[PDB]
Design a protein around this ligand. Structure first.
Ligand SMILES: Nc1ncnc2c1ncn2[C@@H]1O[C@H](COP(=O)(O)OP(=O)(O)O)[C@@H](O)[C@H]1O
Ligand SMILES: [Mg+2]
Length: 234
């Protein structure tokens, strides 16, 4: 499957924070959208997911333009999303967090939803935290639960908005491996970060954004040697 954004634009009070942004992510690859804080990464994700109105542009899955589809319909079509900010239910256990999201799985019986929660806990290395309250978890643990929550909806594409934010250096290793596993499983992964080198290493290719504009695309080695990229990190 293919998810494409074309000519996305968004302004706040006239300030153009995303301008003429186009990108593609296909099943089975990890694609980066990388650039400094404020570059427009989250805003771009918002327009793809359906969280904020776009000022311009199109969202396309395969042959179908889904620009007019509400958030819930785009999700059904395969768009999954991990917010940058905390999204876990802090008062609820890991298990209850997962079961809450799994209630949207009308294709599964109640027992099958329970089965899926157990599978997800094992896959994300959080099954030992089944009954732990979200509030009690470390940043890294919470992030694993949040990614599991995103996956519970069975998406084709997963937009990870800074999955390493608030995660200790140690926990980052496992999350990277989980993300690599997602790609291996056939998910299309679009991942944001301000730490270019760290996240680039796990990308097959990446777009670099600066002040609302795409300035470069390529493999990690191409990006690290691109003068247009160097030019904004002087
Ligand atoms: N609701 C809003 N009103 C005004 N400005 C906003 C709003 N949301 C985001 N912005 C601005 O848009 C710019 C891009 O934000 P964002 O897309 O979150 O950047 P990034 O995720 O790349 O750090 C930021 O400078 C931010 O101040
Ligand atoms: Mg952001």
């Amino acid at each position: 499957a293919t998810l494409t954004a074309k000519n996305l634009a968004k302004a706040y009070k006239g300030r153009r924070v995303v301008e003429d942004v186009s990108l593609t992510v296909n099943s089975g690859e990890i694609v980066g959208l990388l650039g400094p804080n404020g570059a427009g990464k989250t805003t771009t994700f918002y327009m793809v997911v359906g969280i904020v109105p776009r000022d311009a542009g199109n969202i396309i899955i395969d042959d179908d333009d889904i620009s007019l589809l509400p958030l819930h319909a785009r999700a059904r079509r395969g768009i999954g999303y991990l917010p940058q900010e905390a999204s876990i239910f802090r008062r609820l256990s890991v298990y209850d967090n997962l079961m809450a999201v799994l209630q949207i799985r009308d294709d599964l019986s109640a027992e099958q939803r329970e089965d899926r929660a157990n599978e997800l806990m094992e896959e994300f290395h959080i099954e030992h935290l089944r009954d732990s309250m979200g509030q009690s978890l470390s940043g890294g643990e919470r992030r694993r639960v949040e990614i599991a929550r995103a996956l519970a909806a069975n998406p084709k594409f997963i937009l990870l908005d800074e999955p390493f934010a608030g995660v200790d250096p140690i926990s980052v290793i496992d999350i990277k491996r989980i993300i690599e596993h997602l790609r291996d499983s056939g998910l299309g992964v679009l991942i944001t970060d301000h730490n270019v080198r760290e996240t680039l290493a796990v990308c097959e290719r990446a777009y670099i954004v600066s002040q609302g504009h795409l300035i470069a695309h390529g493999t990690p080695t191409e990006i690290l040697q691109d003068e247009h990229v160097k030019r904004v990190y002087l």
